[PDB]
Amino acid sequence: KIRIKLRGFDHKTLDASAQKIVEAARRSGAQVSGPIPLPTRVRRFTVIRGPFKHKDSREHFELRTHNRLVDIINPNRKTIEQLMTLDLPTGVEIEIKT
Amino acid sequence: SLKKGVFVDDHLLEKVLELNAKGEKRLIKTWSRRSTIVPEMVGHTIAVYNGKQHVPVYITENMVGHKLGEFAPTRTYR
Amino acid sequence: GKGDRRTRRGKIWRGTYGKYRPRK
Amino acid sequence: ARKALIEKAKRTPKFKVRAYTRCVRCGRARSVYRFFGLCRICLRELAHKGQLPGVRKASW
Amino acid sequence: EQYYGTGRRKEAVARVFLRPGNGKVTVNGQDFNEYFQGLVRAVAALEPLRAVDALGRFDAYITVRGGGKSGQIDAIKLGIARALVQYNPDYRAKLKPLGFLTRDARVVERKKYGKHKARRAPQYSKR
Amino acid sequence: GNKIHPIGFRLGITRDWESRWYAGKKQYRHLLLEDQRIRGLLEKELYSAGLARVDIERAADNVAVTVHVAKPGVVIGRGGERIRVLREELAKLTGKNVALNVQEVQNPNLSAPLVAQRVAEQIERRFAVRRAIKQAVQRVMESGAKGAKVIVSGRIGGAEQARTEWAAQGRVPLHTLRANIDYGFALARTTYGVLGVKAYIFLGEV
Amino acid sequence: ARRRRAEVRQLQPDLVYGDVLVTAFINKIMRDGKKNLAARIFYDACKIIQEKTGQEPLKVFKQAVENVKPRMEVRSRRVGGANYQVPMEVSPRRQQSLALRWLVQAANQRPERRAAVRIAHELMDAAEGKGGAVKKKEDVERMAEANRAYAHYRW
RNA sequence: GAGCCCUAGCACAGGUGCUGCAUGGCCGUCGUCAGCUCGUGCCGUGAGGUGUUGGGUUAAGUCCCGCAACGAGCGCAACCCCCGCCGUUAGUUGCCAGCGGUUCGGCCGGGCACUCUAACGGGACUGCCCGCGAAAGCGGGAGGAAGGAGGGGACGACGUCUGGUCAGCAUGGCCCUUACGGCCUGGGCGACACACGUGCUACAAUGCCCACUACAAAGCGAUGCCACCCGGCAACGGGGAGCUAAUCGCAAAAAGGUGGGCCCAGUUCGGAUUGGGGUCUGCAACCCGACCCCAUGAAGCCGGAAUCGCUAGUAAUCGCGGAUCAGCCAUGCCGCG
């Protein structure tokens, strides 16, 4: 039972990047428990638009950490093939656990 | 307001304790108005800076526990 | 109410806890 | 002064109380968002360029 | 044996489960009148029944979670209604007239900058 | 003074970031300060190349710098003795292993940040603003573009009175999100003061 | 209201007598959106109408209101000079608005310490037709008559 | 006399020194107002006009009909985000929903149904009916979570105010260069006879107090949140488990509901002011920190002339979080419900 966390600012290249990680584990391992979407940690910034004294009117900036999760029940190396380096994630991260 | 020391300045004490072997000087001028007036080292007169000058403050028993700044007021006509 | 340190309401408003509003 | 100052804010000083922030570009004291070492202006600036990643136009 | 409709109203969601026969109503492992204890309006949540005639003749087991009480009262009011249309496509033409069937979109409008409060605007002094 | 930065406005669609690397509260801050002083030195000692974008990707001790230009042969050297010194200037301050790709703009008259840069250039060589603007737009409009526009701010022709010339062609639907509008801002230090150049070029759709 | 006529906002029937007029009156009792506390009051007060008279509350209620509706009132008006209190017929929707508003105001003018009582005794004093609400209502009606001389300006 | 570092010179540094009326950039504003234009033709000696005007209609120069104009551009609308309904994908957050074991806490096997989480789609079009209309469209009815811009954002034309800012930054000029630079310690920005703006807390019984009583809705936390123990009336101090956090913590939601108290009083309203004892952060709390507990309990009984906000989940009212941040003078602001 290999279980993996994936963070990302980019909601597209996760459901993308870490869901090829479901082909290369059903095609090369056995049973998968599909992609699970963890709720998001949304850091927000509120910024006064002008250099000087314009306290009403500012603009809203968010920085949104998306969180996806993957479970597979197959600690063999018929899997750990693609699933070590066979890349398409460029602004992503990995948590590796069992 | 603390209870683990009386956060009084080294540079001042050093100068009082070392005056405490026959020492009766007025010429004593500090800048640490932040330092607590400490149990019994009284008799003397300390010139406390108010930001513009030091002030001849005589120090008595009834007035321990208080800081030095309390006796050297910093602003004018009040 | 909200102005009185020594009420429940006082404490809530002020953020604090104490004798007049404990932490259970 | 703002130089002898941009400089002084870099020395780890006697007592950490004296340790302040400073917009790392727009070399500046106030409204310094800690997650970016960035002054609210020199900040709205880079954000607009996309030179701070994931950072975006918020709207709800 | 079992019947379901989901109600929502403003952060609050209702799990409704209708069962045939009776009259009693659980909400969150608690009697109705124990959950909505002397809150004048609660008697409203079951008004969908009163309108069909199943005033009593149904049991109800209920989960209810989300923000706050008076919403939940309405949340249920939809569940109940939705649940019993899925025990009768013929339960349309009487429930829709009083429309216990419309979700009701009205949420907290959002706090805007420069205002104090979404619409309430700061205090002008002119002179 | 109204009007949003039309890149900022487009980051969701129609425009990606110039730093695509992930992180977290702990080192995002410096993965920025470094990240910048990079495109810092790059922009200065690479001007002659003429650099449009300068993307950056990361993944811990690697950093895929991708300097876009239209003069690639100026980043390079002879066989490669500039591009050699530079991948070495990068790792000089950056305690890291610096990948340093190069790209080319097939058409530098569709790269607003150059079009602006161009016009700025002319200005410092006491040129003729109204015309420069006039030409630049044309140049761009010539090379296949679906509309475009350029603004010089003020102190035109050394004038005591600051003013603001601008010319436009085709479309520039600045309110349409699905536009794809390269924007670029050239500066322009002159003997009597700064002017400011803004270039817009419209391409996209559906 | 420059564009439209604005729909008479439609109210949710009384969950206890089934009357829109009642909710209306409950709302006028309400302070800072404490609708719960408000209904307690109205009902506790209907309690105090049995406990004191033979007849049905909904009936005292309907009636108290009826007596408090004004039929004419003065509306102010611009003329070449200063202003004119111009008497004119008071529209049904407003009659209702004013009645309820006045009942609640008059109620909280009374001396008794607990709200449901005040509401009740005022409701009672009204159907009998002698509350301070029916007072500040004959004041209007009378005042529209005082000014009967200017009734040739009504728009 | 390679580099480095010292003292003596030198070229220079430095300047939050002046000019926003030399400037860039960015902002405010009329104003999300329904406008401002151009190309060609046409009319006029010409400035210019026509177009854009008119009649109908829109939230709109929105569209319709008409017309010496016919078309375009920056606007408006739409393309993006959030909130309503439904579907697909997906199972450490959902449950007896169904059954079994439950130390009776979804806790345990077990399942994703449902709730949710988050990605992607569907859905609304004046498409349908009746009436009026030449048309656009208007009024009404159906069905539908939603109906005629369903609700809230982001988004600010040509220009205007020689608006704002040289103290964020960039910059031309100008000016000081053992001092208009720099360093430190202390004071100041916290002064107080007065006067205004914006707020907070009240003046009470639709109220105040004390008790018991899950209805959760955004966000933050590994030099942190800190459960839970014990000491203390408490602030807080010991200890001390868990969480790189849909898993652990901040966290009590408060208004509410139930019970009891107060009984119309300057009060069991109100908590200013002052005396005292302490806690914490910090090198350090006199000037000048917040917090706890004892005492002290002020003006205030709803406010002259004036005057501000808001059209619906709005106003009113009740809490919750965050940014800066050692601590905090936040009753401020940005957000949640």
Ligand SMILES: [Mg+2]
């Ligand atoms: Mg100006």
Ligand SMILES: [Mg+2]
């Ligand atoms: Mg300017």
Ligand SMILES: [Mg+2]
């Ligand atoms: Mg000025």
Ligand SMILES: [Mg+2]
């Ligand atoms: Mg001026």
